[PDB]
Amino acid sequence: GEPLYTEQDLAVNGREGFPNYRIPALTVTPDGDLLASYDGRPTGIDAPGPNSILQRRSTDGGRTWGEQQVVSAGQTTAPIKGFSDPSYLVDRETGTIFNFHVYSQRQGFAGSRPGTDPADPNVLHANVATSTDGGLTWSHRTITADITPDPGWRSRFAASGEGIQLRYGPHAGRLIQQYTIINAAGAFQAVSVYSDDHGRTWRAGEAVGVGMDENKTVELSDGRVLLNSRDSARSGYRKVAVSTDGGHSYGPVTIDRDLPDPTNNASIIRAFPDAPAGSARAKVLLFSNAASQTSRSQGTIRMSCDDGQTWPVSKVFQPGSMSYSTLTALPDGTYGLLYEPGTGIRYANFNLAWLGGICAPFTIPDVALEPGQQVTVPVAVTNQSGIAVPKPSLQLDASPDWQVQGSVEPLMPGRQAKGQVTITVPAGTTPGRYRVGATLRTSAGNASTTFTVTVGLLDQARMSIADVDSEETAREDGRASNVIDGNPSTFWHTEWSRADAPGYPHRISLDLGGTHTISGLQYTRRQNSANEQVADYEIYTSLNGTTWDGPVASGRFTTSLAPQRAVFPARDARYIRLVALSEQTGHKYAAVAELEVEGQR
Ligand SMILES: OC[C@H]1O[C@@H](O)[C@H](O)[C@@H](O)[C@H]1O
Ligand code: NA
């Protein structure tokens, strides 16, 4: 009906007893009470810090909130004890509420030492506060032994937010709470901690991935359990994995490109928790995170209607600073959101009318053209339920002096619609990769996508490596071939340490895959490291591949994270070579994220 979005702060840094309030966790008790838990940081730091687990309660749907009570109190005086990162799990069958959190003594997550002994002050323990009276009183347990099946698991912490109780299949009733472990090999993995006896005993299942962190799980419409992870390896995205069992294991982990993330926590819940298996309502997910890849800001709620395959809906709830966010389905049909705005922890409530709308994900392919060209590309839209939409619009978002227009036929229930986009780009358009936003406007809600229009660059898929002076391939993936894959997150790296290899006259040559008239080369520095940045370069070209002619260009490029051009009077060439002569701060390695060649296909 009428759109709703209201907010209020539950904790304000400096007020009510603590200098710092962080890490939100939201839930709704069986009686309909809302419970909000967060850390109270007297020192403004996580574990080993003397943090406390607090709690505020709302008995009127989230409008008014009670006083801040303590769930797990940390000791500031020696010996120092702390409680951090809460995560709620409500057993809807029995009514018990679990608040999972970290119990620290001397070490935190990165410094915890092997062991399961509650007494050992050097391991980071996994605790659980249990309540059978709605959250009023709690009973504490240290469950580290129960969940550390492999002695190599030297550290752990429960991903804050809220866990889940399975409703479908043979493992229906099972409580699952996600964790992050540090194995023997030093790797950060994800593991599900579950209980089949309503929480009396907790076992850990099989660990997943490498470079994982705070992860989240949801039950799909068919009973499958999807996992959505923060990526410690910082690719600017969420890692996802899925499971089909009850001794818990997930298949391969992959990066989801529809979900940008600045390596931060995020929520993913079932929009209709009590829907039947297989139904449309059972397929609707809500995900909240910070959409920025360089900052913890641009907090946005996204919506899926096909179990997480597509994410057509999105809307920003906090354009400004936004870090951790947690979601919860309220019994009135709305959704509760607890997040970090930089001032502490704030509570928000919104309904689906406020999101925009329409479950009509659409695809528009990636286009390559020469400046001064026009191209028309097809649009394919997949439609949802009570949606017979006779007049939908297509609003494209591009560079102002580019003419972009689009149209789509009507949307009929359960059918696919067709359409097209015409892009005309001017002759003086600088070669590059262009992101074009697409918005399917309809009187029943929003639906958006993005495609890429590449102007004036050759096709990398036709490119290969002719030669390279050195590639790091033992300790990491520093392959010369990572420059031609269209991903700034992967890089070529010169054979680095743990093998005292060559120094600076470094070089990489590309086989363009046929003769082309080229006038330039663009290069992108390695993004998350500053010590292998190329300074002085020289470009050489060739048609036979053995006799090289140049330097066709020379220069010193900057420390810019975006692509940098190296232009030269057009010429025919089958091969292009970049000779790196020095590094920005005199270091010995070279790493290039991407190499783009400007020319005519
Ligand atoms: O020795 C190579 C490595 O050195 C590290 O100090 C650096 O942070 C890494 O990005 C990698 O370059
Ligand atoms: Na790359």
Coordinates of C-alpha atoms and ligand atoms in Angstrom, one line a residue:
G1 CA 0.0 0.0 0.0
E2 CA 1.4 3.3 1.1
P3 CA 5.3 3.3 1.2
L4 CA 6.9 3.2 4.7
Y5 CA 10.4 3.9 6.0
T6 CA 10.9 5.3 9.4
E7 CA 14.0 5.2 11.7
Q8 CA 15.2 5.9 15.2
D9 CA 18.5 5.4 17.1
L10 CA 18.7 2.8 19.8
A11 CA 22.3 3.5 20.8
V12 CA 24.3 6.8 20.4
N13 CA 28.0 6.7 20.9
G14 CA 28.9 8.4 24.2
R15 CA 25.4 8.2 25.6
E16 CA 23.9 5.7 28.0
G17 CA 27.3 4.5 29.4
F18 CA 29.6 3.6 26.5
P19 CA 31.9 5.5 24.1
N20 CA 31.3 3.0 21.3
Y21 CA 28.4 0.9 20.2
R22 CA 28.7 -1.4 17.3
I23 CA 27.8 -4.8 15.7
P24 CA 24.0 -5.0 15.3
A25 CA 21.8 -8.2 15.8
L26 CA 17.9 -8.1 15.4
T27 CA 15.2 -10.6 16.1
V28 CA 11.5 -11.1 16.9
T29 CA 10.5 -13.3 19.9
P30 CA 7.7 -15.8 19.6
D31 CA 5.4 -13.3 21.5
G32 CA 6.1 -10.7 18.8
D33 CA 8.6 -8.6 20.8
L34 CA 11.5 -7.1 18.9
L35 CA 14.9 -7.6 20.4
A36 CA 18.0 -5.6 19.4
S37 CA 21.4 -6.6 20.7
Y38 CA 24.8 -4.8 20.0
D39 CA 28.3 -4.5 21.6
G40 CA 29.0 -1.8 24.2
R41 CA 32.8 -1.0 23.6
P42 CA 34.4 0.8 26.6
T43 CA 37.7 1.0 24.7
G44 CA 36.2 1.4 21.2
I45 CA 37.8 -1.8 20.0
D46 CA 36.8 -5.4 19.3
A47 CA 38.2 -8.5 21.1
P48 CA 40.4 -8.8 23.3
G49 CA 38.7 -5.6 24.5
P50 CA 36.4 -5.6 27.5
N51 CA 33.2 -5.4 25.5
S52 CA 29.7 -6.1 26.6
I53 CA 26.6 -7.6 24.9
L54 CA 23.7 -5.2 25.4
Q55 CA 19.9 -5.5 24.6
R56 CA 16.9 -3.2 24.0
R57 CA 13.4 -4.6 23.8
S58 CA 10.3 -3.3 22.0
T59 CA 6.9 -4.6 23.0
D60 CA 4.9 -2.4 20.6
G61 CA 6.3 -3.5 17.2
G62 CA 9.4 -1.4 17.3
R63 CA 7.9 2.1 18.0
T64 CA 9.1 2.5 21.6
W65 CA 12.2 0.7 23.0
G66 CA 13.0 -0.2 26.5
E67 CA 16.1 0.4 28.6
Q68 CA 19.5 -1.0 27.6
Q69 CA 20.0 -4.1 29.6
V70 CA 23.2 -6.4 29.8
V71 CA 23.2 -9.8 28.4
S72 CA 26.9 -10.7 28.8
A73 CA 29.0 -8.3 30.9
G74 CA 32.7 -7.8 30.1
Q75 CA 35.3 -7.1 32.8
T76 CA 37.4 -4.0 32.4
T77 CA 39.7 -4.7 35.4
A78 CA 42.3 -7.5 35.4
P79 CA 41.7 -10.1 34.4
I80 CA 40.1 -8.6 31.3
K81 CA 37.0 -10.4 29.9
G82 CA 35.0 -9.3 26.8
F83 CA 31.9 -10.3 24.9
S84 CA 31.5 -9.3 21.2
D85 CA 29.6 -9.7 18.0
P86 CA 26.1 -10.9 18.9
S87 CA 24.0 -13.1 16.6
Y88 CA 20.4 -14.1 17.5
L89 CA 18.7 -17.5 16.6
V90 CA 15.1 -18.1 17.5
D91 CA 13.8 -21.6 17.7
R92 CA 10.2 -21.0 16.4
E93 CA 9.3 -24.6 17.4
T94 CA 10.3 -24.5 21.0
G95 CA 10.5 -20.8 21.6
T96 CA 14.1 -20.6 22.8
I97 CA 16.3 -17.6 21.9
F98 CA 20.0 -18.0 21.4
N99 CA 22.4 -15.1 21.4
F100 CA 25.8 -16.2 20.0
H101 CA 28.9 -14.1 20.7
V102 CA 32.7 -14.1 21.1
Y103 CA 34.2 -14.6 24.7
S104 CA 37.6 -13.1 24.8
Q105 CA 40.3 -13.0 27.5
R106 CA 43.8 -12.1 26.1
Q107 CA 43.6 -12.8 22.4
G108 CA 41.3 -11.6 19.7
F109 CA 40.5 -13.3 16.3
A110 CA 43.8 -12.9 14.5
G111 CA 45.9 -13.7 17.6
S112 CA 44.0 -16.6 19.1
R113 CA 46.2 -19.7 19.8
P114 CA 45.1 -23.4 19.4
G115 CA 42.8 -24.9 22.0
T116 CA 39.3 -25.6 23.3
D117 CA 39.9 -25.2 27.0
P118 CA 37.5 -22.5 28.4
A119 CA 40.3 -21.7 30.9
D120 CA 42.9 -21.0 28.3
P121 CA 43.0 -17.2 28.1
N122 CA 44.7 -17.3 24.7
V123 CA 41.9 -18.8 22.5
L124 CA 38.9 -16.9 21.3
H125 CA 35.9 -18.8 22.5
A126 CA 32.5 -19.4 21.0
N127 CA 29.8 -18.6 23.5
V128 CA 26.0 -19.0 23.6
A129 CA 23.5 -17.2 25.9
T130 CA 20.2 -19.2 26.0
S131 CA 16.8 -17.9 27.1
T132 CA 13.6 -19.8 27.6
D133 CA 11.6 -16.8 28.9
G134 CA 11.6 -14.4 25.9
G135 CA 15.1 -12.9 26.4
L136 CA 14.6 -11.7 30.0
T137 CA 17.2 -14.0 31.7
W138 CA 20.1 -15.9 30.0
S139 CA 22.2 -19.0 30.6
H140 CA 25.8 -19.0 29.4
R141 CA 27.8 -21.8 27.7
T142 CA 31.2 -21.9 26.1
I143 CA 30.7 -24.3 23.1
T144 CA 34.2 -24.2 21.6
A145 CA 34.9 -27.9 22.0
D146 CA 31.6 -28.9 20.5
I147 CA 32.4 -26.9 17.4
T148 CA 36.1 -27.4 16.8
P149 CA 36.2 -30.8 15.1
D150 CA 39.7 -30.2 13.7
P151 CA 42.6 -29.1 16.1
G152 CA 43.9 -26.8 13.3
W153 CA 40.9 -24.6 13.6
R154 CA 42.8 -22.0 15.8
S155 CA 40.2 -19.2 15.8
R156 CA 36.5 -18.6 15.5
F157 CA 33.7 -16.1 15.7
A158 CA 30.0 -16.2 14.9
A159 CA 28.9 -13.9 12.1
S160 CA 26.7 -11.3 13.8
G161 CA 23.2 -10.7 12.7
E162 CA 20.8 -13.5 12.9
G163 CA 20.8 -17.2 12.3
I164 CA 18.0 -19.5 11.0
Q165 CA 15.8 -22.5 11.7
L166 CA 15.2 -24.8 8.7
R167 CA 11.6 -25.3 7.8
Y168 CA 11.8 -27.7 4.8
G169 CA 12.8 -31.2 4.1
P170 CA 14.3 -33.9 6.5
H171 CA 16.4 -31.4 8.5
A172 CA 13.4 -29.2 9.2
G173 CA 13.7 -27.8 12.8
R174 CA 17.5 -27.5 12.5
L175 CA 19.1 -24.2 13.9
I176 CA 22.1 -23.0 11.8
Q177 CA 24.5 -20.2 12.9
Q178 CA 27.4 -19.3 10.7
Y179 CA 31.0 -19.0 11.7
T180 CA 34.5 -18.0 10.3
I181 CA 37.5 -20.1 11.3
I182 CA 41.2 -19.8 10.8
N183 CA 42.5 -23.2 9.8
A184 CA 46.0 -24.8 10.3
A185 CA 47.1 -23.4 6.9
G186 CA 46.3 -19.9 8.1
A187 CA 43.3 -19.7 5.8
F188 CA 39.9 -17.9 6.7
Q189 CA 37.0 -20.3 6.0
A190 CA 33.3 -20.5 6.5
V191 CA 31.5 -23.2 8.6
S192 CA 27.8 -23.8 9.6
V193 CA 27.2 -24.6 13.3
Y194 CA 24.0 -26.5 13.7
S195 CA 21.8 -28.2 16.3
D196 CA 19.3 -31.0 15.7
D197 CA 18.1 -31.2 19.2
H198 CA 16.8 -27.7 19.6
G199 CA 20.0 -26.3 20.9
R200 CA 21.1 -28.6 23.6
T201 CA 24.2 -29.7 21.6
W202 CA 25.9 -27.9 18.6
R203 CA 28.1 -29.5 16.0
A204 CA 30.1 -27.9 13.2
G205 CA 29.9 -29.1 9.7
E206 CA 32.4 -29.0 6.8
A207 CA 34.3 -25.8 6.2
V208 CA 34.2 -23.9 2.9
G209 CA 36.3 -21.5 0.8
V210 CA 39.5 -19.6 1.2
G211 CA 39.6 -15.9 2.0
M212 CA 36.1 -15.9 3.5
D213 CA 34.7 -14.0 6.6
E214 CA 31.4 -13.1 8.1
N215 CA 29.0 -15.2 6.2
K216 CA 25.2 -15.7 6.1
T217 CA 22.7 -18.5 5.3
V218 CA 19.1 -18.6 4.0
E219 CA 16.8 -21.4 3.2
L220 CA 15.7 -21.4 -0.5
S221 CA 12.3 -22.4 -1.9
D222 CA 13.4 -26.0 -2.5
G223 CA 15.1 -26.5 0.8
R224 CA 18.6 -25.7 -0.4
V225 CA 20.7 -23.5 1.9
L226 CA 22.5 -20.6 0.2
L227 CA 25.6 -19.0 1.8
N228 CA 26.5 -15.4 1.2
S229 CA 30.0 -14.3 2.2
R230 CA 32.1 -11.2 2.9
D231 CA 35.4 -11.7 1.0
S232 CA 38.5 -11.0 3.1
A233 CA 40.5 -11.2 -0.2
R234 CA 38.8 -7.9 -1.2
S235 CA 37.4 -8.5 -4.8
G236 CA 34.7 -5.8 -4.2
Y237 CA 32.0 -8.5 -4.2
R238 CA 30.1 -11.2 -2.2
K239 CA 31.1 -14.8 -2.4
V240 CA 28.3 -17.3 -2.6
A241 CA 28.1 -21.1 -2.1
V242 CA 25.1 -23.5 -1.8
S243 CA 24.3 -26.7 0.1
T244 CA 21.8 -29.5 -0.4
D245 CA 22.4 -31.4 2.9
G246 CA 22.3 -32.3 6.6
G247 CA 25.8 -33.1 7.7
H248 CA 26.5 -29.7 6.1
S249 CA 28.6 -29.1 3.1
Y250 CA 28.7 -26.4 0.4
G251 CA 29.7 -26.8 -3.2
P252 CA 32.2 -24.5 -4.9
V253 CA 32.4 -20.9 -3.9
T254 CA 32.2 -18.3 -6.6
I255 CA 31.9 -14.5 -6.7
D256 CA 28.5 -12.9 -7.4
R257 CA 28.9 -9.9 -9.6
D258 CA 25.4 -8.5 -9.0
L259 CA 26.4 -7.8 -5.4
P260 CA 29.1 -5.1 -4.9
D261 CA 30.5 -5.0 -1.3
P262 CA 33.4 -3.1 0.3
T263 CA 34.4 -6.2 2.3
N264 CA 31.8 -5.6 5.0
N265 CA 29.0 -7.6 6.7
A266 CA 25.5 -8.0 5.2
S267 CA 22.1 -9.5 5.7
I268 CA 20.1 -11.9 3.5
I269 CA 16.7 -13.1 4.6
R270 CA 13.6 -14.8 3.3
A271 CA 11.0 -12.1 2.6
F272 CA 8.1 -14.7 3.4
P273 CA 9.5 -17.1 6.0
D274 CA 6.4 -19.1 6.5
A275 CA 5.6 -19.7 2.8
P276 CA 5.2 -23.2 1.4
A277 CA 8.0 -25.0 -0.4
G278 CA 8.1 -24.4 -4.2
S279 CA 5.8 -21.4 -4.1
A280 CA 6.6 -18.0 -5.6
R281 CA 6.6 -16.3 -2.2
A282 CA 9.2 -18.9 -1.0
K283 CA 11.6 -17.6 -3.7
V284 CA 11.7 -14.0 -2.6
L285 CA 14.9 -12.8 -0.9
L286 CA 15.9 -9.5 0.7
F287 CA 19.6 -8.6 0.9
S288 CA 21.0 -5.5 2.6
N289 CA 24.6 -4.2 2.4
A290 CA 26.7 -1.1 1.5
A291 CA 26.7 -1.0 -2.3
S292 CA 30.0 0.9 -2.6
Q293 CA 33.2 -1.1 -3.4
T294 CA 35.6 1.5 -2.1
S295 CA 33.6 2.6 0.9
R296 CA 31.2 1.6 3.7
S297 CA 28.4 3.8 2.4
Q298 CA 25.5 3.6 0.0
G299 CA 23.4 1.2 2.1
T300 CA 21.0 -0.5 -0.1
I301 CA 18.2 -3.2 0.1
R302 CA 18.0 -5.5 -2.9
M303 CA 15.3 -8.0 -3.9
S304 CA 15.3 -11.4 -5.6
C305 CA 12.3 -13.4 -6.7
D306 CA 14.1 -16.5 -8.1
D307 CA 16.1 -17.8 -5.1
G308 CA 19.0 -15.4 -5.6
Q309 CA 19.8 -15.9 -9.3
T310 CA 18.8 -12.4 -10.3
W311 CA 18.6 -9.1 -8.2
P312 CA 16.3 -6.7 -10.2
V313 CA 15.2 -4.6 -7.3
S314 CA 17.4 -2.2 -5.3
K315 CA 16.8 1.0 -3.4
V316 CA 19.1 3.0 -1.1
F317 CA 18.2 3.4 2.5
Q318 CA 21.3 5.3 3.6
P319 CA 23.3 7.2 0.9
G320 CA 25.7 8.2 3.6
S321 CA 27.9 6.2 5.9
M322 CA 26.8 2.6 6.3
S323 CA 28.6 -0.3 7.8
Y324 CA 27.0 -3.4 9.3
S325 CA 23.3 -4.1 8.5
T326 CA 21.0 -6.8 9.7
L327 CA 17.4 -7.7 8.5
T328 CA 14.3 -9.2 10.1
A329 CA 10.8 -10.1 9.1
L330 CA 8.3 -8.5 11.4
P331 CA 5.0 -10.2 12.1
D332 CA 3.1 -7.2 10.8
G333 CA 4.4 -7.8 7.4
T334 CA 7.1 -5.1 7.4
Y335 CA 10.8 -5.6 7.8
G336 CA 13.1 -4.4 10.6
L337 CA 16.6 -3.2 9.8
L338 CA 19.3 -2.5 12.5
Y339 CA 22.4 -0.8 11.1
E340 CA 25.5 1.2 11.8
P341 CA 25.4 4.8 10.6
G342 CA 28.6 5.8 12.2
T343 CA 26.8 7.3 15.3
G344 CA 26.2 4.0 17.0
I345 CA 23.4 1.6 16.0
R346 CA 20.0 2.7 14.5
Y347 CA 16.7 1.0 14.0
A348 CA 14.6 1.2 10.7
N349 CA 11.3 -0.3 9.5
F350 CA 10.2 -0.5 5.9
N351 CA 7.6 -2.3 3.8
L352 CA 7.8 -3.6 0.2
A353 CA 5.8 -0.6 -1.2
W354 CA 8.8 1.5 -0.3
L355 CA 11.3 -0.6 -2.3
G356 CA 10.0 0.4 -5.7
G357 CA 9.1 -2.9 -7.1
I358 CA 8.6 -5.4 -9.9
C359 CA 10.1 -8.7 -10.2
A360 CA 11.0 -8.4 -13.8
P361 CA 14.8 -9.0 -14.1
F362 CA 16.1 -8.1 -17.6
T363 CA 19.3 -8.6 -19.6
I364 CA 20.9 -6.3 -22.3
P365 CA 24.1 -7.7 -23.7
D366 CA 27.5 -6.0 -23.7
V367 CA 28.3 -4.0 -26.8
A368 CA 31.5 -3.1 -28.6
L369 CA 31.5 -0.3 -31.3
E370 CA 33.7 2.2 -33.0
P371 CA 33.3 6.0 -32.1
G372 CA 30.7 7.5 -34.4
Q373 CA 28.6 4.3 -34.6
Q374 CA 25.0 3.5 -33.6
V375 CA 24.3 -0.1 -32.7
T376 CA 20.9 -1.6 -31.6
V377 CA 20.9 -4.4 -29.0
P378 CA 18.0 -6.6 -27.8
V379 CA 16.5 -6.5 -24.3
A380 CA 15.0 -9.7 -22.7
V381 CA 12.7 -9.3 -19.7
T382 CA 11.4 -12.1 -17.5
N383 CA 8.1 -11.3 -15.8
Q384 CA 6.5 -12.2 -12.4
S385 CA 2.9 -12.6 -10.9
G386 CA -0.1 -10.3 -11.0
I387 CA 1.7 -8.3 -13.6
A388 CA 0.0 -7.6 -16.9
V389 CA 1.9 -4.3 -17.6
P390 CA 0.7 -2.7 -20.9
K391 CA 3.0 0.3 -20.8
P392 CA 6.6 -0.1 -19.4
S393 CA 9.4 2.3 -20.1
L394 CA 13.2 1.9 -20.5
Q395 CA 15.3 4.8 -19.1
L396 CA 19.0 4.4 -19.8
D397 CA 21.8 6.2 -17.9
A398 CA 24.9 7.2 -19.9
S399 CA 27.3 10.0 -20.8
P400 CA 25.3 13.2 -21.7
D401 CA 26.6 13.6 -25.3
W402 CA 25.7 10.0 -26.1
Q403 CA 22.2 9.3 -27.6
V404 CA 20.7 6.4 -25.8
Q405 CA 17.1 5.2 -26.3
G406 CA 15.2 2.0 -25.5
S407 CA 11.8 0.3 -25.7
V408 CA 10.1 -2.8 -24.5
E409 CA 6.9 -4.6 -25.5
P410 CA 4.2 -5.2 -22.8
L411 CA 4.8 -7.5 -19.8
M412 CA 2.2 -10.4 -19.6
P413 CA 2.1 -12.7 -16.7
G414 CA 4.6 -15.5 -16.7
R415 CA 6.0 -14.7 -20.2
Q416 CA 9.2 -13.1 -21.5
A417 CA 9.1 -9.7 -23.2
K418 CA 11.3 -8.3 -26.0
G419 CA 12.8 -4.9 -26.6
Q420 CA 15.9 -3.0 -27.8
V421 CA 18.4 -0.3 -27.1
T422 CA 19.9 2.1 -29.6
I423 CA 23.2 3.7 -28.6
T424 CA 24.8 6.3 -30.7
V425 CA 28.3 7.4 -29.6
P426 CA 30.1 10.5 -31.1
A427 CA 33.3 10.4 -33.1
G428 CA 35.4 12.1 -30.5
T429 CA 34.6 9.6 -27.9
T430 CA 37.6 8.5 -25.9
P431 CA 38.3 4.7 -26.0
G432 CA 37.2 2.9 -22.9
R433 CA 34.8 0.7 -21.0
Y434 CA 31.5 2.3 -20.4
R435 CA 28.9 1.3 -17.8
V436 CA 25.4 2.0 -18.9
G437 CA 22.5 1.9 -16.5
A438 CA 19.1 0.6 -17.5
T439 CA 15.8 1.2 -15.6
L440 CA 12.6 -0.6 -16.5
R441 CA 10.0 1.8 -15.3
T442 CA 6.5 0.4 -14.7
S443 CA 3.5 1.6 -12.6
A444 CA 4.0 -1.5 -10.4
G445 CA 7.7 -0.9 -9.5
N446 CA 11.3 -0.6 -10.5
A447 CA 13.7 -3.0 -12.2
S448 CA 17.3 -2.2 -13.1
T449 CA 20.4 -3.6 -14.9
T450 CA 23.7 -2.4 -16.3
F451 CA 25.5 -3.3 -19.5
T452 CA 28.9 -2.3 -20.9
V453 CA 29.5 -0.4 -24.0
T454 CA 33.2 -0.7 -25.0
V455 CA 34.3 2.0 -27.5
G456 CA 37.5 1.7 -29.6
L457 CA 39.3 -1.2 -28.0
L458 CA 40.3 -4.6 -29.5
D459 CA 38.9 -7.9 -28.2
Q460 CA 40.9 -9.4 -25.4
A461 CA 39.4 -12.8 -26.1
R462 CA 41.4 -12.8 -29.3
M463 CA 44.6 -11.9 -27.4
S464 CA 47.3 -14.0 -25.9
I465 CA 50.7 -13.7 -24.4
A466 CA 53.6 -13.6 -26.9
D467 CA 56.3 -13.4 -24.2
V468 CA 56.9 -12.1 -20.6
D469 CA 60.1 -11.7 -18.6
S470 CA 58.7 -13.3 -15.5
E471 CA 55.4 -14.4 -13.8
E472 CA 54.8 -15.2 -10.2
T473 CA 53.0 -18.6 -10.3
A474 CA 54.1 -20.4 -7.1
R475 CA 53.1 -18.4 -4.1
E476 CA 50.2 -16.7 -5.9
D477 CA 48.5 -16.1 -9.3
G478 CA 50.6 -13.5 -11.0
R479 CA 50.0 -14.9 -14.5
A480 CA 50.8 -12.9 -17.6
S481 CA 47.3 -13.6 -19.0
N482 CA 45.6 -12.0 -16.1
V483 CA 46.1 -8.7 -18.0
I484 CA 43.7 -9.7 -20.8
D485 CA 40.8 -11.1 -18.8
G486 CA 38.6 -8.0 -18.2
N487 CA 39.1 -8.1 -14.4
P488 CA 41.0 -5.4 -12.5
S489 CA 41.1 -7.7 -9.4
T490 CA 43.5 -10.2 -11.1
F491 CA 47.0 -9.1 -11.9
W492 CA 50.2 -10.2 -13.6
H493 CA 53.0 -10.2 -11.1
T494 CA 56.7 -10.5 -11.7
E495 CA 58.2 -13.6 -9.9
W496 CA 58.4 -12.2 -6.4
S497 CA 60.3 -13.1 -3.2
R498 CA 60.8 -16.7 -2.1
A499 CA 62.8 -16.8 -5.3
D500 CA 65.2 -13.9 -5.7
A501 CA 64.2 -13.2 -9.4
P502 CA 65.0 -10.4 -11.8
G503 CA 64.8 -6.7 -11.4
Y504 CA 63.3 -3.9 -13.4
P505 CA 63.9 -4.0 -17.1
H506 CA 60.5 -5.9 -17.0
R507 CA 58.3 -6.5 -20.1
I508 CA 55.1 -8.1 -21.3
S509 CA 54.1 -8.7 -25.0
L510 CA 50.6 -9.3 -26.3
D511 CA 49.7 -11.2 -29.5
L512 CA 46.6 -9.2 -30.7
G513 CA 45.5 -12.2 -32.7
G514 CA 45.8 -10.7 -36.2
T515 CA 46.9 -7.5 -37.8
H516 CA 45.1 -4.4 -36.6
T517 CA 45.5 -0.6 -36.9
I518 CA 46.3 0.4 -33.4
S519 CA 46.8 3.8 -31.8
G520 CA 47.2 3.2 -28.1
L521 CA 47.3 1.1 -25.0
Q522 CA 45.6 1.6 -21.6
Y523 CA 46.9 0.0 -18.4
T524 CA 45.4 -0.3 -14.9
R525 CA 47.7 -0.5 -11.9
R526 CA 47.4 -3.4 -9.5
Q527 CA 44.5 -2.1 -7.2
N528 CA 45.2 -3.4 -3.6
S529 CA 49.0 -3.0 -3.5
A530 CA 51.2 0.0 -4.1
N531 CA 54.7 -1.5 -4.4
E532 CA 54.7 -3.0 -7.9
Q533 CA 53.4 0.1 -9.8
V534 CA 54.9 0.8 -13.2
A535 CA 56.6 4.2 -13.6
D536 CA 58.7 4.6 -16.8
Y537 CA 57.5 2.7 -19.9
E538 CA 58.3 2.3 -23.6
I539 CA 56.0 0.7 -26.1
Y540 CA 57.2 -1.4 -29.0
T541 CA 55.0 -3.0 -31.8
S542 CA 55.5 -5.8 -34.3
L543 CA 53.9 -7.7 -37.1
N544 CA 56.3 -10.6 -37.3
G545 CA 56.7 -11.0 -33.6
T546 CA 60.5 -11.4 -33.7
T547 CA 61.7 -7.9 -34.9
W548 CA 60.3 -5.2 -32.7
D549 CA 60.0 -1.6 -33.7
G550 CA 59.9 1.3 -31.3
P551 CA 59.9 2.9 -28.9
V552 CA 56.6 4.0 -30.4
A553 CA 55.8 5.7 -27.1
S554 CA 57.5 6.5 -23.8
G555 CA 56.5 8.2 -20.7
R556 CA 56.1 7.8 -16.9
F557 CA 52.7 7.0 -15.7
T558 CA 50.9 7.9 -12.5
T559 CA 49.7 6.2 -9.4
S560 CA 46.1 6.5 -10.7
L561 CA 43.8 3.5 -10.0
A562 CA 41.8 4.1 -13.2
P563 CA 43.2 3.2 -16.7
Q564 CA 46.0 5.3 -18.2
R565 CA 46.5 6.0 -21.9
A566 CA 49.6 5.6 -23.9
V567 CA 48.7 7.0 -27.3
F568 CA 50.7 6.9 -30.6
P569 CA 50.0 7.8 -34.3
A570 CA 48.0 4.9 -35.7
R571 CA 49.8 2.0 -37.2
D572 CA 49.4 -1.6 -38.1
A573 CA 50.6 -4.2 -35.7
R574 CA 49.9 -7.8 -34.8
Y575 CA 51.9 -7.6 -31.5
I576 CA 52.3 -4.9 -28.8
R577 CA 54.9 -4.9 -26.1
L578 CA 55.1 -2.9 -22.9
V579 CA 58.6 -2.5 -21.4
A580 CA 58.5 -1.4 -17.8
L581 CA 61.8 0.4 -16.9
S582 CA 61.2 1.4 -13.3
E583 CA 58.7 1.2 -10.4
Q584 CA 57.0 4.2 -8.8
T585 CA 58.9 4.0 -5.5
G586 CA 62.0 2.1 -6.7
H587 CA 60.8 -1.3 -5.7
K588 CA 61.6 -4.5 -7.7
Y589 CA 58.4 -6.0 -9.0
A590 CA 55.9 -5.1 -11.6
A591 CA 52.2 -6.0 -11.5
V592 CA 49.6 -5.0 -14.1
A593 CA 45.9 -5.6 -13.5
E594 CA 44.7 -5.0 -17.0
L595 CA 46.0 -4.2 -20.5
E596 CA 43.6 -2.7 -23.1
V597 CA 44.6 -2.0 -26.7
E598 CA 43.0 0.9 -28.6
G599 CA 42.4 0.1 -32.2
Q600 CA 39.9 -1.1 -34.8
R601 CA 38.4 -4.6 -34.6
Ligands
LIG1 O1 56.3 -10.0 -1.6 C1 55.0 -9.8 -2.3 C2 53.9 -9.5 -1.3 O2 54.4 -8.5 -0.4 C3 53.5 -8.1 0.6 O3 54.1 -7.3 1.5 C4 52.4 -7.3 -0.2 O4 51.5 -6.7 0.8 C5 51.7 -8.2 -1.1 O5 50.7 -7.4 -1.9 C6 52.7 -8.9 -2.1 O6 53.1 -7.9 -3.1
NA2 NA 43.2 -8.8 -14.8

